[PDB]
Design a protein around this ligand. Sequence first.
Ligand SMILES: Cc1ncc(C[n+]2csc(CCOP(=O)(O)OP(=O)(O)O)c2C)c(N)n1
Ligand SMILES: Cc1ncc(C[n+]2csc(CCOP(=O)(O)OP(=O)(O)O)c2C)c(N)n1
Ligand SMILES: [Mg+2]
Ligand SMILES: [Mg+2]
Lengths: 806, 806
Amino acid sequence: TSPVIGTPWKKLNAPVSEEALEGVDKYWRVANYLSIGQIYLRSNPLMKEPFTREDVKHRLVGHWGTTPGLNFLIGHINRFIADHGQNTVIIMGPGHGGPAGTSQSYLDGTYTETFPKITKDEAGLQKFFRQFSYPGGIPSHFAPETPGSIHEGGELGYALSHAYGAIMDNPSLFVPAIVGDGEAETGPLATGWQSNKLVNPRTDGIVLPILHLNGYKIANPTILSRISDEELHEFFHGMGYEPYEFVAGFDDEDHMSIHRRFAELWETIWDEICDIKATAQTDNVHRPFYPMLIFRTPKGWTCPKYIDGKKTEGSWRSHQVPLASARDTEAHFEVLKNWLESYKPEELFDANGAVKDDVLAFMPKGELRIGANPNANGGVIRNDLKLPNLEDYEVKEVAEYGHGWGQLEATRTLGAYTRDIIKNNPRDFRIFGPDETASNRLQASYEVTNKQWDAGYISDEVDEHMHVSGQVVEQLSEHQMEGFLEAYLLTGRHGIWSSYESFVHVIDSMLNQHAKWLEATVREIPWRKPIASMNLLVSSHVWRQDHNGFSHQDPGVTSVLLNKCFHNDHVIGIYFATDANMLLAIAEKCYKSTNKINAIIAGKQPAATWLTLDEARAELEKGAAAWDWASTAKNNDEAEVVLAAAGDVPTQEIMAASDKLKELGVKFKVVNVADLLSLQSAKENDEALTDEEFADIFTADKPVLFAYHSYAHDVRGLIYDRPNHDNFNVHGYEEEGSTTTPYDMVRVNRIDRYELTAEALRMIDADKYADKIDELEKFRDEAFQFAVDNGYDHPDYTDWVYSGVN
Amino acid sequence: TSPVIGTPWKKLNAPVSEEALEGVDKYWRVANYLSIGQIYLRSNPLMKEPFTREDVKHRLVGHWGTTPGLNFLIGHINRFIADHGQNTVIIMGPGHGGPAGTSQSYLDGTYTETFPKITKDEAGLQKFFRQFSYPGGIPSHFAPETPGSIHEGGELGYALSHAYGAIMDNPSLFVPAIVGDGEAETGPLATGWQSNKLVNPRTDGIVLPILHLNGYKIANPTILSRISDEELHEFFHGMGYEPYEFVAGFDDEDHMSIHRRFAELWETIWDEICDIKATAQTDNVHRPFYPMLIFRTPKGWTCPKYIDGKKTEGSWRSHQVPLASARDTEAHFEVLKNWLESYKPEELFDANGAVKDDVLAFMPKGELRIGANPNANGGVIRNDLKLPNLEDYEVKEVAEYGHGWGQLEATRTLGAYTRDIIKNNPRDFRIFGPDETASNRLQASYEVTNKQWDAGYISDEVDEHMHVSGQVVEQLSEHQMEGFLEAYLLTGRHGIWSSYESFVHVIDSMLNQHAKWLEATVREIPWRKPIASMNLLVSSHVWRQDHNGFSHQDPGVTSVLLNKCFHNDHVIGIYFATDANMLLAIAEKCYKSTNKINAIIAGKQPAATWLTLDEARAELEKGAAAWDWASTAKNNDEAEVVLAAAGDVPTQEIMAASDKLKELGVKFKVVNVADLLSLQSAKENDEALTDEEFADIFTADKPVLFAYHSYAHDVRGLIYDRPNHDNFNVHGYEEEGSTTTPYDMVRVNRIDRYELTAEALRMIDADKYADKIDELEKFRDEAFQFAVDNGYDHPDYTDWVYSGVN
Ligand SMILES: Cc1ncc(C[n+]2csc(CCOP(=O)(O)OP(=O)(O)O)c2C)c(N)n1
Ligand SMILES: Cc1ncc(C[n+]2csc(CCOP(=O)(O)OP(=O)(O)O)c2C)c(N)n1
Ligand SMILES: [Mg+2]
Ligand SMILES: [Mg+2]
């Protein structure tokens, strides 16, 4: 559960003290000095003479155009957290301002705790300076290695979705979400503005969006900064916000004056937020206007105004590095030396090199710190889900009526299971879906919870299962759902989210980024505890898009997921639910797991059930298993072909083809691969099937016919070094489809039962079976003409039931 | 179910024709002429010469100060109903404007249909004129004998509650509720203004309040007319209305100019109403501002301006009768003759005396007429409730563990029964309660319906079971609830309403009025079909008001109900539920009944159960029955006393006293009277117990001890001519109570078990039982001192269970 920390939502009821703002100004100066020492210096952190070009880095990498503004906001937020005792997580949208975050971690004392070799003295300062963006050092962005970070910020557009996710079901947590003005042009964040219509001020926390409007992107100005102030305020008010505006640094006003003005503006905003929270305890049915801060400052605000006669401060020329070579001229080194001395570090550091005590007296202590906040490290919060007994949801008719029974929909079983998980776990488990929960048949959870909706209600003929609080969030944006769930998991909670297969590509970037958060975490960051897994139910898949057609058919999610399987990280799982029982086993395993991205590919269509629960779990631990009840060959020597399958429709076609093969006396084996990554190379993947086990499943000399859900490229690229891999003949999706009957969909991809039987016959003896092969091939065309003439699939195809049903 | 009539909520989308307003003016003139002929004329309706004082009534009775304004509004509403085809019921708040209603019934043709002897010619006009307020004629007010009337209007303050009741669950019905400005000063109607917060524009109809602000009461001006127009509009807007205002007749403007102006204003109001209705089909969660019309006119608007030098028109002098004696002077007769000729009746009537055809061409036809509308005669709409099987709700533990078992609450059984009646009958059965449904334990109906509430919603920690539509209405006003239910029944629907016993007095007037609507209906009005019964669950009665005390104890409802039992009308039923099974039988009988007021007095406290369902019904058909299982005497000769009871606490005390009497060998009988009115005189009440049956129940010579719920006066006034009535010793409530333990409440009223045993012993032998009587009397005082010392009742009293429990 999310803990209550400090004294949440308290008003100051006093002026901001002068001593605190003294401390805030000194903090800002020292944070800018650290952020510059990290970029430019490799030695001599405190500029003991001789300070020469020997002390400067050979290759200057990093960013400065956002760092002083971030340091300003972070120092003021630190004063605020010390004063109010607020439970606060900062989300840094422009993550390229990494030196700001590392300077915070260093100054609040958490960096030395996490990394003991970076001491708080001259040698520790030298190591801290050298390690930024260095061989064998720390990254340039706001990284998982950086304490106090739940968001990398490298790939832009997801500060707001992550903020609204982090506050969900989390009522005491305050999140200032700093948003770059260039990042605000990206598609994800524009729609992430509208997510205050999906949170409740009573049951969820408060997100304060700080638009960091410094006017410029890389080498280009931002649209928001160059439209009129009337337009900007009107725009933010049309999205349910009260815009506040702060402008600074565009004239010669004293810094103390700027800090004072910001103190007053910040406390005004905090009082509006506290009023909203206090009102929500009585009335939470009508939405408030949350304050949001527009923070207009010059880009690179403390750097030299002009360098080489080019406007540097207040321009895009300060984005990455002013003084691109302070190492190769004497004039640029003098500019750099003057820039470092303009902060007066001589008074901010003591003799031994530690930041002076009066510079950090205004700082929060203990669990209130940014790097120490448990919501930033959501693995220490996390507790296991309390799971219902799986045998309660098993489809038992397979156990007595025989394999292949029924016309059930696989995802309804997961719906019931997830409903009871929600029942056992309220306020820790949440279901997201881009308008598609009821189309993936996960609506059984409406028996115990509602869709959280905080826009207007109009009627009850149209607004069923909607409520101002709920455990089902549903907005038509995959970016929103994925950011919500990722921030939900990163804070310590659990969740599933469902989607159409073809639109998972919309978040290929986001998944990639999350994999990079996991790949980095499992490799080099032990102090970050495991978080829950990102569970993605992929349904309404390529083979059954009757209503939509070719635009909704693209199973390429498997390919993008296969690219993140390296160095024994195991941060990826791709599971194929052949039926409801296998889906139960997969979902149980996935809900128990940690630090992974689990894509469970299950169909919503009426499909037969093949396994019992014990059989399903037994197939699960191996990933691939032989179906002894479907095989006609007792041992590996007898079979004239191995028929392997991965996916519900490929499984159905393999089984129907096996029925026809039985009538011709063909001895074959039947294999089902539930988990794709078990087929990976044994030396590469230590949890994949060993080579002996793989050869036992697939006969070394005998041909293997493989029917696969996605593109066959993904199977062939995975088994390349496996034994008997030359004989594998993968049949997968082949970018051929439309709106048409279900048999046609598999016909045009050469994955129907007739084509599979003909493929197996050709693997054995093309000459002996020539007449039967011809008969099958002309039957495919007759059965297509049947669907054209009559509008539905052939009775031979529709009515087929496996021979193993009693 | 409420029928859909005509084409509801249709906009005209055209100007009001000139021909229609020609007709409206001619209608208004002829309606005023009829309303004056009724008051003043007994002969010569069309003033054929010689028109002399012979033609005038000897005793002029009736009212005129509201009649021409009512005729104006009714003629315009008639034009509106003809044009739009609206389902409309008019509620006439100032019911003393009876000639207006009878003139309408006469002019739209329904009066001749209902009363064939009032033809539409000269003789019929003469009879119509003479019969108003005459010996052997029709009443002065807007009476049940008057077609098109659901509201008498004699006793003021309930036009608005009746309107909002008539539109409930009735979505196509339009109700213009005409409200007198003096009547608006009464307490009931002031709170009946606020009832637009309890109706839904989608599921309920539309009430248009027309404030008939003619400035004067009887001999006094009204508060609303003499406050500023700003105040009046501000007041009506603070109650959720849009005030429209029409002013007429206060200058020399032409009548047509007034009819035209009213046509535009009326169509504007209708368009706002139609907009509200169309919006409600999409959004019904947010309350609209319903239009209401302020209709400022001079009182007695077409009468002579001055009579005897006194301002008559536009004054309170025109309330009842200008020209109080047009029979006793020649000058007043000339004033009357000029008044009648000012309407030019010579052109409004043909030779034979019928109203000319062009005067009524604009009139509605068929079912759309006011007197023909089925919602005015709610007995033709009515259908029986579909009732669940009673045996499903029986308390079966009495059948096997023995009589006297348990500590159940009686009203929870009725709650479950009513819940299933609601389930079987949605939109035809409704539960009302003055904030007291959950305190009478009728909340089992929240399993199938909600409280209808259309004010604001704030949270869900406080707003459970509330919804913009529902079958439970609940406002803290007994007037509101009773008017809602009475208009609900008068329109054809069914309902229960619950209340504390002591506050039923708040509606003694209203009940009286409804009884007068029923007494008149069952005697002389056959064409009015039976309506459902007014069912009043009286709970939280006098004997168990622990929290409240003396202010909440007044059982005087029985007395006011007994005053309406005359002439074999049977419009009253008073039932005492001794336990849950008897309550089931009573409620089943009451829900089946028609044209009655059924007061069911049941306790909400934990009380023992004495009867099985079959026994309860067997006691029910007789009203009084002997308990053979509790009697120690086999025949009427053996018993030395008869112990009779009526009420759950009196029943408990009789049974506990019978237990003590058994230990002393006393032979007694036990009688329970479920229905009070069976004890009435046989010759007076043909459905009461005959004299032989009464003597069989109560032994002729043997003393009878009667324990009664209410004041003993009510029992003694009922059995006065019955045999053995001299020996009856009634023990009832005696205005002695407080906040104290339950035994104390019956102690201070001489109705406890010890005092009852002593009473019975004194009836037999005071001398023989002197020691035992003394012991009982001092035990009462010891058991009171026990409660004073320890705070709860004696173990001898609390723990007592009947000896018949196995
Ligand atoms: C989607 C995406 N496109 C491009 C980039 C490359 N990039 C890195 S930083 C940056 C500019 C930062 O813009 P802004 O939000 O205005 O930041 P600031 O002014 O704080 O530097 C860009 C385009 C990116 N990170 N993500
Ligand atoms: C509660 C109540 N008190 C007193 C009366 C006696 N009464 C009969 S008519 C009347 C005056 C009518 O007043 P208002 O509503 O202004 O009627 P209008 O101006 O239409 O005559 C009164 C007081 C009554 N009917 N009801
Ligand atoms: Mg920018
Ligand atoms: Mg008046």
